[PDB]
Chain A
Amino acid sequence: NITDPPRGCVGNTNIWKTGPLFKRVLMSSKYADGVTGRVEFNEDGDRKFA
């Protein structure tokens, strides 16, 4: 059920099916990436312990 994002700005007149599941999946990565490392973005979508 991973529907691709709709294309265009006028043809699309509906909300994408991939909604809360996509956000929950995106806010689920926990590894050591980047200079800051330890990507632990949660709550509103911001990292912790910088």
Chain B
Amino acid sequence: PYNLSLEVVMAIEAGLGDLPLLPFSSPSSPWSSDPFSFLQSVCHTVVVQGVS
């Protein structure tokens, strides 16, 4: 409803910033063993993006 326009927000592990027009390849670091930090980051990114 209300002429919705779809927007996709990629909640990658990297910090929020302007999307760059250049492919950068770097080695992936191991995931943090604390899931609470990941949950808080996901919640903050969703709130900022207003993800439905």
Check if B35 is an interface residue, CB within 8 A of chain A.
yes
Give how many B residues have a beta carbon under 8 Å from the other chain's beta carbons: 4
Chain B, Cβ-Cβ closest to A13: B35
Number of A-B pairs, beta carbon distance below 8 Å: 7
A10 and chain B: residue at smallest CB distance: B34
Closest to A11 in B: B33
Q: How far is the CA of A9 from the CA of B37 in the complex (A)?
A: 13
Q: How many angstroms from the CA of A16 to the CA of B34 in the assembled complex?
A: 19
> Which residues of B have CB within 8 Å of A9?
36
Q: Give chain B's interface residues, CB within 8 Å of chain A.
A: 33-36
* Chain A residues with a Cβ under 8 A of chain B: 9-11, 13
